[PDB]
Amino acid sequence: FIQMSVQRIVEDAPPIDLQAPPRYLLKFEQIYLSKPTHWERDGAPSPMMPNEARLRNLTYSAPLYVDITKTVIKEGEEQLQTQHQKT
């Protein structure tokens, strides 16, 4: 599920098409997972051990990131393609 299904689900999702007339497209390509992390009150990330999750009543969850490519067309024969890596 993590290695294949999640990536396939993101890949198989249709690109988001939006029209104003400027046109906007969003395409999600690559999926990244980090190791299970817990964020302290100060906001400092740290690896979350399963025992700490059990002791502190945390959820053993891994952050999920997706590479998103955004292309915008403003009917001015110019195309701007900006990619947000690991969203």
Binding site: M4, Q7, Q30, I31, Y32, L33, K35, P45, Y65
Partner: peptide, 12 residues
């Protein structure tokens, strides 16, 4: 065929 990639450090 793209697969999910394990990431050593959480994205900041």
């Amino acid at each position: 065929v793209r697969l999910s990639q394990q990431l050593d450090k959480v994205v900041t």
